[PDB]
Design a protein around this ligand. Sequence first.
Ligand SMILES: [Cl-]
Ligand SMILES: [Cl-]
Ligand SMILES: [Cl-]
Ligand SMILES: [Cl-]
Ligand SMILES: [Cl-]
Ligand SMILES: [Cl-]
Lengths: 266, 266, 270, 266
Amino acid sequence: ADLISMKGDVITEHQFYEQVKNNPSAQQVLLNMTIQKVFEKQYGSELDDKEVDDTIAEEKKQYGENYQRVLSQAGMTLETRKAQIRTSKLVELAVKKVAEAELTDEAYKKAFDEYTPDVTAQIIRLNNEDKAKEVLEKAKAEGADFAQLAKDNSTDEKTKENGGEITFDSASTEVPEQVKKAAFALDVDGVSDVITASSQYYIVKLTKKTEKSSNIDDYKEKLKTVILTQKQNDSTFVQSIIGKELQAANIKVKDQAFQNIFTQYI
Amino acid sequence: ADLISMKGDVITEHQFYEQVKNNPSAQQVLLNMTIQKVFEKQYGSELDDKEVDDTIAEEKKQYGENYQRVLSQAGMTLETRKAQIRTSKLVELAVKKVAEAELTDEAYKKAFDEYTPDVTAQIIRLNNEDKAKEVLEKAKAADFAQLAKDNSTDEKTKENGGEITFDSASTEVPEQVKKAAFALDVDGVSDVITATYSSQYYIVKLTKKTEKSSNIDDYKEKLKTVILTQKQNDSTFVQSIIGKELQAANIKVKDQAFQNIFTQYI
Amino acid sequence: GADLISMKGDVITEHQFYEQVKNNPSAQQVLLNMTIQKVFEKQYGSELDDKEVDDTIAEEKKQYGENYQRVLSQAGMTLETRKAQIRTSKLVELAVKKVAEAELTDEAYKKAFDEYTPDVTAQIIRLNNEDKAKEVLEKAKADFAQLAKDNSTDEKTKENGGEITFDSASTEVPEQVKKAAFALDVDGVSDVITATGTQAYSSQYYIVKLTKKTEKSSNIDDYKEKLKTVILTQKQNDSTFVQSIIGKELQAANIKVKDQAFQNIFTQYI
Amino acid sequence: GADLISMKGDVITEHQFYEQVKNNPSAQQVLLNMTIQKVFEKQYGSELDDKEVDDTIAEEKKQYGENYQRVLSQAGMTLETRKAQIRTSKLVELAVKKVAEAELTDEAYKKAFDEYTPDVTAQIIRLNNEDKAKEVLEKAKAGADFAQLAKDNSTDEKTKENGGEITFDSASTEVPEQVKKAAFALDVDGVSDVITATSQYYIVKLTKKTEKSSNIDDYKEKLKTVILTQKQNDSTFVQSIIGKELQAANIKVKDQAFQNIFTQYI
Ligand SMILES: [Cl-]
Ligand SMILES: [Cl-]
Ligand SMILES: [Cl-]
Ligand SMILES: [Cl-]
Ligand SMILES: [Cl-]
Ligand SMILES: [Cl-]
């Protein structure tokens, strides 16, 4: 109950709460706790722990020895960050499930009209931007071998061996969004500009293009993936899903200090 | 008590405490609560309430009609800010005492040596260097008061012939103007002095100069103010006084989560 | 030792003048400053290039102009020993930056990261009169770039439609202007902000229009360098800190004060 | 020459210290004072007994008490140099007196005579508070005996025990100029209003007024002492005497650093 003690006085946990409740950073914590509980009740039994555990494991490799430090500077630990990813994946799972159910034929067609089928291309991934520009000037030379440039310079171990080559749709998650839209904009044998997506630098050469069908029926599972991704990144949709899940949980704010921050949702 | 309720669950105050205690902005609130209680205990009787009201009055004038908006951004009200300002003055007061107590004869000797008593002069300030050179050829040959009235940009001195009295400790006039002025003879005109958002140009005419007395007591309080004002703005000094006052209060941090924000002090 | 003054049937020698001048407070400071110079040259001298010292004294000569020679006399300096003083100052602040860097804790970085607010773009309109600021405020309830271009006293911002980018740590913008701007929403106009009438500056009045706001990241490393500089420049301007480093460095030299007259001026350090 | 400071692999010597310190304005003042001291000690020194200085030293030492060592330190000085300063001061005034005596003229005597007011006996009640002064002012004007009012109320310890009584002329420095001019304007046995000197508050009663004689010969020696004392307190006169005495010594400045500070005299 006592947080701090001194000569002739103490600070209690409740005294600490009564001061800190007006802090906007602390108000955000109660909002995020409420989003966690509501979404845990609704979709927590549907979300596997392996979905969270793989992502927190994935994130630990990206930072490595800096991971303990950066979390402590943000005021977090292994558990609190795990809860944050879990919360984020519960909202995403809810957006996925509500979107899936609302998939219309009129929706499938809109995606179908803007869809692109398999496109083979040679991609070179880079770290240094000075290298990326130096690789690009070589790629536009008279008899420039794009394959050897990929073999010599590219960081991507999987495509590096095969002269940077890769095949992908609009629905592929294995290549970035900015990289794909650059690839579809090119003519065949066209080399892209330096595409950017502690970030990564890409150059793409368009090799092949495949014909798209009239019949939508065979592209159903891939158009589904495009529409879901669009809904995952439509913030107006994501905020509605949060708002509607909170309204369905029937949250009552007991202390009036936290009344305004829930107004966006309630 | 409960803070949020929903279908078959509540977020309790203690659960909110357990999440929010790691929040860096929250950790600052407890530290400030601890500083507020200790400094009130020791220096509260000495501090008069009127100069706390002078600061919040000045602060209300600065922001004007942005004050409630700026206060809400910080997560505060007029009352809680007035408490925060009171704490600042209690720390300021304690810092002043320890600075007063650490005054040596050597610091006075040094401050006395570097001090130059009040001189009276006439200054012309200009934005353009080549206009300052044009005005200087007139000034060095002349009615200096009129030249200031017609050319000077300093709106404070301009109207009364560019007239000004200052000593070495003066913050009204720049270092280079002061030093240039002290080095002049009476009725002498300086060269263009350049003070360094935007650099300015100056022409100084010395009217009068006070003779610096032998005895140090003649400028005792003026030198005391120089030495204390310097210590008041040293963050390292202020943070050391806070630390020593917290150690004299015999603080025990009971919750491990706050241990780190206190190690700098205790 | 030589003779400094000669009269009929008597002289003042250099040793006799020394034996009197050693009690002069100003003279005791000169021995202290000669001591600081020698120690800081031995330690950090090799690191400092002479070009930067030549830049400072060249800048300084332009600032004073033909006043400079006259001004150096009053400071107890010739051109040579001023150039040496500037060098010593640079060697001190160089040494203070190293120890400040070496004493950086994670809590210092964390506290700075918490209090720091990232770059926001905005348009400002500085004004001399209060009644004119009330006039422009109601008009700016609008093309804020035009209202800046016509009315703004700040000639730096006026050219680019009043626009400016700044952190919380920017000293280019006043504290109350920054705090007012961070409290706005995007495309939001503040009421009149007032920099009050003090001795140095006359009272200024500001109207702020927030244009862009960076979202504050979760990763400290995105702002590490800006947070590093604000913590270091704080310690650089702390007189107590600089004095402690000087005192530490003088203690490391193992200085023996031979003449008793100077013992007290060294006691603050040793 | 000897070593002042030593450290690892280096020393600062006396000559090195001299070559630096000689450009310092305060150090240049010391040498000018040493030169004034040696010249005046050579010419006039035999006339001044050290008892004269020792009496003045014992006066200061008895005043400040056991803070005497500290107040000398605070003034950038010691017993030996302060003793030398008093000595040099007394030899200058002694030398100035001789020139003043020889330059006495009947014009000078006539001007002193016109401004002179002869001996006046008056009872002064020195008061620290203005409220307490106006109370005693009422009591004196009523019936009342003025000697007891001074005994039972005056702060000046010397006059208090003698019934506030003191005798003086226009020359006497032991009573203030505002009090003297008030006293000369009263009628015999008349009481003044409250007088402010600057802040102490005086009430005068004129006991005895000497009628001023028509003959200058009746005040010859007193008027002489006025003229000489006036020449003593005239800074321009004193400086000129020091200046001319330095010229007579045939002073060569053997170092160009000190050339300018002597040029103020020679
Ligand atoms: Cl093929
Ligand atoms: Cl504050
Ligand atoms: Cl002391
Ligand atoms: Cl020096
Ligand atoms: Cl707004
Ligand atoms: Cl005493």
